[PDB]
Ligand binder design. Structure first.
Ligand SMILES: [Ca+2]
Length: 119
């Protein structure tokens, strides 16, 4: 299986995040106010999303990174962010650690490629 560690925190500790792979929710966690590692494994290899799902007054999520099969993918390096509040809207910008609105940061497919190397 593929190992995925999500490192994230909630602003008030009520926040729920789901790890989704190829559209399938493989695990859900309630966050604490401290950056913490959360780990799951899956045979699925689709697009990895870290999704904030229970936005309410006072709730926001900050994602540091994920680790996929030993490889760190920084949240701020991800061009897809559908939750950050920027330019007066949800998902206003890529390359953010933040999910303010319900939405997700996409970290790409489990298996990536470069010059015929698969990682
Ligand atoms: Ca490989």
């Amino acid at each position: 299986s593929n190992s995925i560690t999500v490192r994230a925190r909630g602003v008030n500790g009520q926040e729920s995040v789901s790890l989704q792979v190829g559209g399938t929710t493989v695990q859900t966690w309630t966050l604490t106010t401290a950056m913490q590692d959360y780990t799951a494994s899956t045979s699925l290899t689709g697009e990895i999303r870290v999704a904030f799902t229970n936005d309410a007054t006072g709730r926001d999520v900050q994602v540091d990174y994920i680790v996929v099969n030993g490889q760190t993918r920084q949240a701020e390096n991800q061009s897809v962010n559908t939750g950050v509040w920027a330019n007066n809207q949800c998902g206003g910008s890529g390359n953010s650690e933040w999910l303010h609105c319900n939405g997700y940061i996409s970290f790409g497919n489990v298996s990536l490629e470069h010059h015929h190397h698969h990682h």
